[PDB]
Amino acid sequence: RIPLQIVRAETELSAEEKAFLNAVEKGDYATVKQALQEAE
């Protein structure tokens, strides 16, 4: 009776980075362009 946790935790990225990665994976020639403009 011992709980299970995460020992070697990974530093997650922000919602902006997650959205950028999602757009890159899905494929959007314009959404990725505007995301890069926002990053700039």
Q: Which residues bind a copy of itself (CB under 8 A)?
A: 1-8
- Closest to a copy of itself by CB, 4 vs 15, is 4
- Closest to a copy of itself by CB, 22 vs 36, is 22
- To a copy of itself, the closest distance from the beta carbon of 1 in angstroms equals 6
**HSE value, Cβ hemisphere, 13 Å, CA-based, for 35:** 16
Is residue 31 exposed (0-12), middle (13-18) or buried (19+ Cβ within 10 Å)? Answer: middle
- To a copy of itself, the closest distance from the beta carbon of 17 in angstroms equals 18
